[PDB]
Amino acid sequence: SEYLFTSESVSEGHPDKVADQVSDAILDAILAQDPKARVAAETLVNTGLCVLAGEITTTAQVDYIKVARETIKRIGYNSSELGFDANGCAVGVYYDQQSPDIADLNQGAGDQGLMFGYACDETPTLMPFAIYYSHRLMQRQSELRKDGRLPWLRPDAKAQLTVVYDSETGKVKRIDTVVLSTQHDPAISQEELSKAVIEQIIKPVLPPELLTDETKYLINPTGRFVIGGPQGDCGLTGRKIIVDTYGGAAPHGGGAFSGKDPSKVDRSAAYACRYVAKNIVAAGLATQCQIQVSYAIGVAEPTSISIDTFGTGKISEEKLIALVCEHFDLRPKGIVQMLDLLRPIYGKSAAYGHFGREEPEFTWERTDKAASLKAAAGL
Amino acid sequence: SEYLFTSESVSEGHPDKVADQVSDAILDAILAQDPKARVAAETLVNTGLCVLAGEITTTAQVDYIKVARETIKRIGYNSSELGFDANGCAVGVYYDQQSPDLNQGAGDQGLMFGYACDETPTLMPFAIYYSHRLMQRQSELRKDGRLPWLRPDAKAQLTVVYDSETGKVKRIDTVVLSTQHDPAISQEELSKAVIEQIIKPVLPPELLTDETKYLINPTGRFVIGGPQGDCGLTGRKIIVDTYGGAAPHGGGAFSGKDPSKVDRSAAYACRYVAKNIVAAGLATQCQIQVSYAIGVAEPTSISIDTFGTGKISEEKLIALVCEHFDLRPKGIVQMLDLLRPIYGKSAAYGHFGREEPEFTWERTDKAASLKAAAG
Ligand SMILES: Nc1ncnc2c1ncn2[C@@H]1O[C@H](COP(=O)(O)O)[C@@H](O)[C@H]1O
Ligand SMILES: [Mg+2]
């Protein structure tokens, strides 16, 4: 009668997310000076280490080492006690120029590849339930840390949500398990930590009606969590792509987002697909919607597009594809104009998810086409 | 009536794949001496650069630089002209290296996915299966000198047309293939050679119609390649590594991780289950979702979607799964005999859908028992 689904998120202090944030901080720094820059910035962090590598073509004059250090500092890795310290880490710059062999609305894609977008009616921002609330658990951890309301919190943290679904209706019934692990100063006991995490992080974020007497709260299940981040651990750009998107509720095409300028369809087409699927759901034309597109390097129009409403569509998926092609320009330059992407808006996207946050920067979360799609379908 | 679906693959010379292959070659070298080793080996490649980083707990004594250079050499990066050269690149080792129950419970809440279907001989979705084959063919003709101007780095992408109610492939709509090459060959000669000698020998002839589009090196030149043209990282091809987007993915990368990482071992077991169900004829399309709870060894929940193709009920398939497979985290290691240097081959051309003897999770060795048990 019921089935389980689990998703997870990680804080801005997780080593993979540190690498993502450094990559997009560098992207933003470049885009502030040179909106047309070509950027493919990869980051590896490890013990005392931040390697910057990849291909950049720009007129911007950016101090990459200072930007990387400032990013790590603002995440919270700025004191000796934490092992990893922006003041005492080596930053090495190994950037190349962009390959000339790789290098107006009909300009070609930067690469081949496939991309998925998704939306559903499970949450206020039209996200699947488990990833939406997993991200908000980590954001809440970060919020309390940075303003000092829980001053013993440290940067690295992880959340997991196991949710019980009704097999027939498909709706969320209850939350089965919450897992919350957080780094912390060594002087706080696990018991004090657990009580504060439940009162201040878990209960203020999750819907009260879905926390029952059967809900399991697993706080720091492996014990104390004093050292974290890149101290004795490695982080890499693009190693949290499922956390970054829909948490396993939808397929993924494989491309990472962070460190890539908006001419990389890996990022821009994934954002467009979210925008398309979200406006279809906000238009009331489906309660679940999934889209796949693909490109060929050096071709403008997508080599394929498909839409699935999983039986919830009020019109055929054929008709929806026609609506989409009339209302959205999915050529790479069309997407950039559609979403106003040539702006230093990406640093915030690189932790706590690229989708489901209706921030002014995140144009692909706007539902400004829903009404137009609703009327155009005859509804 | 019909819909499109697209997947892609890359050759062993793609820089993300170079990093995966170095990571798992190092894993294999460690496991050969120390089957119980803990390994989390991350690789970054760029111009003249191979960075080795991560955590290793082993008694093995491995020359990591030599293993990395030999792997890069075997891939074909043998000249500074390519910006990446096994003999001349810098290899830097940053590993934090330390020296050092079937009912052990899980350490994380887990959701893992596995998938199989009857679309291809090894029971894989069509698009990913043939994209891998396109890339292996490129590698093969480069290595045996039939097309000596080929260089290691290449990608392929297939857009396939499916029937909306049948679920069967009806034709191939678009084939994309980009390959690195020696500068001297013209694009006209390269394109003809790729179509006639790589694409046509690999794809089913009856699915290549007059409407099939061929896009070969659509940039117009592909001399610069490998890590110089594109920085490569371990774990950046996880969809290439699995089902090409035909099934959801839970998140984690495979290469560089020993089998104690459920990101790798549980993904392998889920594929093993789904493949054997399909090979038992109990379904023509099968997605399994397996849940774990912290501190519980046996899975807490199993879902099996046969998409209306199941010959018995989902409840009955789940009962057969629980009886015929050990899905406990350490039971999987035993069931698939995973503590062996078998991973280097998995790190290019897909972890799933190849019936190499190393790949215990691709054996259909339980299909006859399943079909027998179902009736
Ligand atoms: N001039 C080119 N034409 C076609 N493909 C290329 C060219 N230069 C690089 N590539 C490929 O594009 C890949 C990018 O794949 P990824 O970034 O992993 O999606 C590179 O690793 C190369 O295999
Ligand atoms: Mg990549």
Side-chain angles (χ1 to χ4, degrees), chain A residues 1-35 37-65 67-69 71-79 82-103 105-167 169-190 192-194 196-208 210-317 320-325 327-336 338-378, chain B residues 1-35 37-65 67-73 75-80 82-97 100-163 166-167 169 171-187 189-311 313-314 317-368 370-375:
Chain A
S1 48
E2 46 195 34
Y3 67 97
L4 299 190
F5 196 91
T6 298
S7 306
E8 70 183 4
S9 184
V10 304
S11 74
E12 65 196 79
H14 185 286
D16 288 328
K17 241 61 194 78
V18 170
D20 285 323
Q21 282 162 101
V22 172
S23 282
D24 273 339
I26 280 167
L27 174 67
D28 278 349
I30 292 162
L31 292 180
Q33 292 177 47
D34 179 12
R38 299 279 173 71
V39 184
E42 311 289 11
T43 308
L44 176 154
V45 292
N46 192 48
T47 305
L49 186 66
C50 179
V51 173
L52 308 173
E55 305 69 40
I56 295 176
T57 293
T58 189
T59 54
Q61 313 265 32
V62 171
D63 184 334
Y64 300 122
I65 289 173
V67 171
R69 296 188 184 283
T71 303
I72 294 162
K73 261 170 207 165
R74 293 184 309 101
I75 286 168
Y77 291 115
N78 61 9
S79 62
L82 301 181
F84 194 70
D85 182 345
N87 303 276
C89 73
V91 187
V93 183
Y94 293 78
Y95 290 135
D96 304 291
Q97 294 295 113
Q98 182 189 49
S99 172
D101 298 352
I102 299 186
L105 277 179
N106 273 306
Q107 115 138 10
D111 198 3
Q112 65 165 63
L114 52 139
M115 308 78 196
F116 292 89
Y118 185 85
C120 69
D121 65 357
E122 286 184 349
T123 57
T125 65
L126 304 183
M127 285 293 288
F129 181 104
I131 186 64
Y132 169 94
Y133 281 108
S134 289
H135 281 329
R136 286 164 82 91
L137 287 170
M138 294 287 90
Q139 280 190 286
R140 177 76 179 175
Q141 190 273 2
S142 187
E143 175 190 355
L144 298 161
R145 178 172 62 78
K146 289 178 185 258
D147 69 14
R149 277 181 281 161
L150 291 182
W152 46 264
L153 286 173
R154 289 183 173 192
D156 199 353
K158 180 168 175 178
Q160 302 187 290
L161 276 180
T162 297
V163 176
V164 176
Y165 275 95
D166 186 280
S167 290
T169 75
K171 329 230 76 177
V172 176
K173 301 185 59 179
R174 63 181 188 276
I175 289 161
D176 171 84
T177 294
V178 191
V179 185
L180 200 305
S181 305
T182 181
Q183 203 189 351
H184 60 85
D185 295 347
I188 181 176
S189 67
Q190 292 312 291
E192 294 163 331
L193 183 152
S194 181
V197 165
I198 293 166
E199 167 189 281
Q200 284 295 329
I201 299 174
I202 294 176
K203 277 175 179 170
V205 164
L206 304 178
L210 303 179
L211 301 181
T212 75
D213 274 355
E214 311 162 274
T215 298
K216 280 149 282 180
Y217 305 88
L218 304 183
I219 318 300
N220 280 13
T222 61
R224 52 207 298 274
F225 186 175
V226 168
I227 299 303
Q231 177 71 31
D233 196 359
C234 190
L236 301 180
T237 305
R239 290 288 293 270
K240 291 281 166 292
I241 67 173
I242 299 301
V243 162
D244 274 343
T245 47
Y246 306 100
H252 199 290
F257 296 152
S258 292
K260 297 183 173 163
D261 71 275
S263 73
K264 272 67 173 174
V265 290
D266 267 358
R267 183 174 222 159
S268 68
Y271 289 3
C273 284
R274 166 64 178 169
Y275 185 60
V276 170
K278 188 182 188 185
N279 276 270
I280 285 173
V281 169
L285 296 172
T287 59
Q288 291 189 256
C289 183
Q290 183 182 290
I291 169 162
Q292 187 201 58
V293 295
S294 66
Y295 296 86
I297 193 175
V299 172
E301 290 286 354
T303 42
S304 76
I305 169 176
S306 67
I307 296 182
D308 197 346
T309 68
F310 305 91
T312 71
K314 289 175 183 168
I315 61 179
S316 77
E317 292 152 354
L320 280 173
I321 293 192
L323 277 186
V324 170
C325 291
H327 289 68
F328 302 85
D329 190 353
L330 301 175
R331 295 167 298 173
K333 293 301 156 286
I335 299 175
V336 166
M338 187 171 63
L339 295 174
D340 191 8
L341 287 187
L342 304 183
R343 288 177 303 130
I345 56 166
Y346 301 100
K348 291 175 56 180
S349 76
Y352 313 112
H354 294 244
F355 305 138
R357 306 151 63 193
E358 305 182 337
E359 308 279 344
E361 291 83 357
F362 303 155
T363 47
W364 54 94
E365 295 292 323
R366 285 171 175 178
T367 54
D368 46 6
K369 296 212 144 68
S372 190
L373 295 174
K374 179 186 179 74
Chain B
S1 47
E2 61 191 24
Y3 66 95
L4 310 177
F5 179 83
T6 300
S7 305
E8 76 180 339
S9 187
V10 311
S11 72
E12 68 195 74
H14 184 283
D16 287 331
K17 241 62 196 77
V18 173
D20 283 323
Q21 283 167 97
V22 172
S23 283
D24 274 339
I26 282 160
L27 169 62
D28 278 346
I30 294 162
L31 288 181
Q33 299 175 39
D34 177 15
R38 295 300 169 86
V39 182
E42 312 292 5
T43 304
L44 180 152
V45 291
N46 196 60
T47 304
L49 179 70
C50 180
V51 173
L52 305 179
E55 301 70 51
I56 290 171
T57 303
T58 189
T59 63
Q61 298 273 12
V62 173
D63 187 336
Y64 299 115
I65 288 175
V67 168
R69 293 191 188 280
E70 175 54 46
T71 307
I72 295 161
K73 172 177 179 189
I75 286 165
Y77 286 110
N78 47 34
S79 176
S80 303
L82 301 187
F84 207 53
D85 170 3
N87 178 69
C89 67
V91 185
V93 177
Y94 294 75
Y95 293 138
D96 176 3
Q97 173 147 337
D101 60 326
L102 287 176
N103 278 327
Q104 168 181 320
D108 298 293
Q109 302 286 132
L111 204 178
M112 331 293 317
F113 297 95
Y115 191 85
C117 66
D118 75 332
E119 286 169 28
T120 54
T122 68
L123 306 182
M124 284 289 287
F126 186 104
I128 185 63
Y129 171 92
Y130 279 109
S131 294
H132 289 323
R133 303 269 280 203
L134 286 178
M135 288 291 88
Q136 299 181 276
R137 178 77 175 178
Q138 189 272 358
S139 184
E140 172 193 358
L141 268 57
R142 165 176 68 80
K143 280 178 172 168
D144 65 36
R146 271 181 288 175
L147 294 173
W149 43 264
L150 288 174
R151 283 175 173 193
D153 190 0
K155 300 174 82 170
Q157 176 178 285
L158 295 172
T159 293
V160 176
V161 187
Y162 284 82
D163 185 271
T166 300
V169 173
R171 71 196 185 268
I172 296 165
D173 178 62
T174 299
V175 186
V176 183
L177 207 157
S178 298
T179 181
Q180 198 188 5
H181 59 86
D182 290 342
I185 186 177
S186 65
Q187 297 302 304
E189 180 178 340
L190 175 150
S191 173
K192 180 160 98 161
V194 171
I195 293 179
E196 301 291 315
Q197 306 193 44
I198 298 183
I199 292 174
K200 279 177 187 182
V202 168
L203 304 177
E206 74 283 10
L207 301 177
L208 296 178
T209 80
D210 301 319
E211 297 140 32
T212 302
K213 289 157 285 308
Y214 299 93
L215 308 177
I216 318 299
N217 279 21
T219 167
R221 190 172 184 271
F222 192 169
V223 168
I224 290 301
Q228 181 188 341
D230 186 21
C231 177
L233 295 178
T234 298
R236 287 280 298 270
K237 286 279 164 295
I238 76 184
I239 301 298
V240 167
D241 281 342
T242 50
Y243 304 100
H249 196 293
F254 295 154
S255 293
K257 299 177 182 182
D258 69 269
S260 71
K261 272 68 163 172
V262 295
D263 276 4
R264 192 176 206 160
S265 54
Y268 287 5
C270 286
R271 161 67 180 172
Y272 183 55
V273 177
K275 186 176 188 177
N276 275 264
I277 296 177
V278 176
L282 297 170
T284 66
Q285 182 182 10
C286 176
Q287 183 174 118
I288 184 170
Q289 302 191 4
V290 184
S291 296
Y292 297 93
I294 291 180
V296 177
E298 288 287 355
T300 42
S301 190
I302 302 184
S303 280
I304 297 175
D305 192 341
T306 61
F307 311 91
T309 80
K311 284 185 187 166
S313 70
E314 172 181 2
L317 271 167
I318 291 156
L320 290 194
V321 165
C322 288
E323 176 160 12
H324 287 85
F325 303 82
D326 189 347
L327 302 181
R328 292 174 304 190
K330 297 283 268 301
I332 286 160
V333 171
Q334 177 177 285
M335 175 178 60
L336 296 173
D337 192 10
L338 292 178
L339 300 183
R340 289 174 307 122
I342 55 168
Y343 300 103
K345 292 173 72 168
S346 77
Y349 311 116
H351 291 243
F352 305 147
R354 309 149 60 193
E355 290 167 358
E356 317 259 20
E358 292 92 344
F359 301 162
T360 47
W361 56 94
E362 289 293 323
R363 291 170 187 183
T364 57
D365 59 349
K366 293 195 173 66
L370 289 168
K371 185 179 173 183

